[PDB]
């Protein structure tokens, strides 16, 4: 199971993706979709691991010294879009929607 919040644990924050705003008119449907993201810290906090964790955000903020705040459950989305060969395809695009957020 996971956390769902809006506006400091590994919680699911909401985010709608806009293809027109990005400038991708090659995607017909959906133009917009609720995708969401996972943000926040993961335990054991705070002692012994702490130096190794704090040293990580100094060296590489993209680096993970332990469990990461990443989606656990991911639902696919059906998409209508233009291909290079001037045709229109319908495809089941996997891992596009964040359902649940947990610690690895």
């Amino acid at each position: 199971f996971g956390l769902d919040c809006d506006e400091s644990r590994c919680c699911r924050y909401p985010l709608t993706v806009d293809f027109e705003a990005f400038g991708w008119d090659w995607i017909i449907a959906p133009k917009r979709y609720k995708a969401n993201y996972c943000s926040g810290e993961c335990e054991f906090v705070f002692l012994q691991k702490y130096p190794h964790t704090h040293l990580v955000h100094q060296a590489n903020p993209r680096g993970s010294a332990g469990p990461c705040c990443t989606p656990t459950k991911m639902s696919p989305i059906n998409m209508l879009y233009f291909n290079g060969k001037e045709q229109i395809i319908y495809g089941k695009i996997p891992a596009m929607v964040v359902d649940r957020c947990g610690c690895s």
């Epitope: 008119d25 059906n78 209508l80 233009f82 045709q87 229109i88």
Partner: antibody
Amino acid sequence: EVQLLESGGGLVQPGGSLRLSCAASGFTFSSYAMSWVRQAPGKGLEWVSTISSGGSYTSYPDSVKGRFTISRDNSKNTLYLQMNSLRAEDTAVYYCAKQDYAMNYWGQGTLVTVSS
Amino acid sequence: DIQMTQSPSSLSASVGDRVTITCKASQDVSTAVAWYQQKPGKAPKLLIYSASYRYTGVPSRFSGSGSGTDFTLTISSLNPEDFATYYCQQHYSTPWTFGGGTKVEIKR
């Protein structure tokens, strides 16, 4: 109130040209992908062409490809269909519609007659 | 290309009746099926998009179901305004092909 109004259709000789227009109003046209679909008198429905919201992308069936060109002018809120090298088999009522997963909201159409 | 075979070609029914219209694809089309309603002298109206999703304003009595090569638009209880022609369509791969149509007549 979403409105789609076709115009520019009628009689034309085979091998001739015709340019259809479709007046969009009541929604943000520049953000919506558009389609042209025809219906020959007794016959059912046939997909003619689809255009991307920006206009960069277009797809056509082999029946009208090379002859017909779907174009748009988002500033004019208008959809176009240039029909060149017309054949009798292109006689139909031509509809313009909003393209999402399927054609949601269709215009009443315009009849194009190709005969000598 | 990809063919849509619609069944029945025509149907005589009365108001309140539960009716089902089937459609079959020449290849696997997943859930990419759209249903439309057209009345004589008028442009078609969208009913269901992507096999089961109903469009805004479409009454709850209209319900699509299916996956692969088998699709069924259902009208739970027939109403006077439901007597029209019904067309299934694929929005899987271009060229986009339609079904033959189903004329729903008023039985008297």
